[PDB]
Amino acid sequence: MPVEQNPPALSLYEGADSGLRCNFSTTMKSVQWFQQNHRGRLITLFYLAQGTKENGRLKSTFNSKERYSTLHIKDAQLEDSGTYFCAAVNMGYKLTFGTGTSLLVDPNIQNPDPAVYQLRDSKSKSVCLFTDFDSQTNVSQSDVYITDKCVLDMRSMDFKSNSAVAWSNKSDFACANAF
Template sequence: GIQVEQSPPDLILQEGANSTLRCNFSDSVNNLQWFHQNPWGQLINLFYIPSGTKQNGRLSATTVATERYSLLYISSSQTTDSGVYFCAVAGNNRKLIWGLGTSLAVNP
């Protein structure tokens, strides 16, 4: 099955800093989603982005499907950005396969 690798596994930032999170996947996909799990456990869907670039406020994401990776950019980070960021992908079987996540801590 498809393998999903996220990097870095852990990240510590000062408030106001920018960061890039990466998601590599081992096979072609037709579904890729980024999620944020906040410290209270809630999973929020950030982007549905099987290809191309999207922006939502301080967050943006780019997926280069032909090269099998996706990037999530966080600009001007805030303490509320802390939590775990997950990338999940699916191929033809339509089952989302999840990465292990990037754990982000933003310090004030």
């Protein structure tokens, strides 16, 4: 394809660095890098006609002759999660998009203590919470539902934690046999 992005997906830990790559099939006039967060907004990170640019913890390089562009992230923060798009302008002056690199930033869990808790409804359906597991844990799995994990940041305590939820209407469902 005219604009190729590598890797398709990336997992990294908070505080780590990573370099994203973008390769072109033809001579490009310029490159534009974007971050698309969970809110769906396309945020311009860089516009380059040549050379290198810095933007906070990000750095980008464009080399028209060698047909590539890179995007570097230093000291990854949870806010860096999202899809990173590379788009380049051809000699026909049209902006062509890559299919994006999906980046997920994981916390470094200080004291892992995987635990399953039962929560009841505030009103008069049962809910199970799986929490405090390390970021290497993958949450798997008809009348039962299990979500993917998410990281929350209790900034008031400088504390981060992972969690997933399971629920069911079925009578035979218990939190002991949920995750």
